[PDB]
């Protein structure tokens, strides 16, 4: 399907963060044999995506927020 | 690249959860015009992936855990 020494830092770059309303999904790829630096990702609600920095406070909150986004309903 | 009314519940099914050591990434796709039910995902450290249920307590902890996985180093 897709696997062959082809793993690049899914988030070569990163953004300080963004409102949790502009995001839609949250892909957090931990560091491994391809990237020793965590890589957070947010799929905007417009089919767009934006990597964030897990070292910043706004990013750590971007995730903690999505988590609640799914609290019963 | 990849976008055309082709969005299916990334997690048609779900698993009660799993240890945070067997996972590697955490893809949380919120519900939208394709799935009205949140969909959590965990990429094992063996290139494998497993969807979890965001309605269970172990799943909500699977995420809260990864978040810490990236706390300075």
């Amino acid at each position: 399907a897709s696997v062959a020494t082809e793993l690049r830092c899914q988030c070569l770059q990163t953004l300080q963060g963004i409102h949790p309303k502009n995001i839609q999904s949250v892909n957090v790829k931990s560091p491994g044999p391809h990237c020793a630096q965590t890589e957070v990702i947010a799929t905007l609600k417009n089919g767009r995506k934006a990597c964030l920095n897990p070292a910043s406070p706004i990013v750590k909150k971007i995730i903690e927020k999505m988590l609640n986004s799914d609290k019963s309903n």
Side-chain angles (χ1 to χ4, degrees), chain A residues 17-72:
Chain A
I18 29 72
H19 227 242
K21 268 239 113 134
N22 255 317
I23 310 158
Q24 221 250 211
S25 87
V26 168
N27 219 350
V28 206
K29 167 134 284 193
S30 97
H34 40 300
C35 210
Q37 327 105 22
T38 324
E39 306 285 39
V40 185
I41 296 125
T43 286
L44 298 181
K45 0 189 89 242
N46 30 296
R48 283 192 119 162
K49 324 84 154 226
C51 276
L52 312 165
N53 220 228
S56 21
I58 290 177
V59 166
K60 304 229 85 134
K61 292 316 311 286
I62 281 152
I63 279 58
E64 223 241 280
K65 257 153 253 157
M66 243 292 260
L67 245 155
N68 209 56
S69 96
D70 34 281
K71 219 293 170 184
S72 223

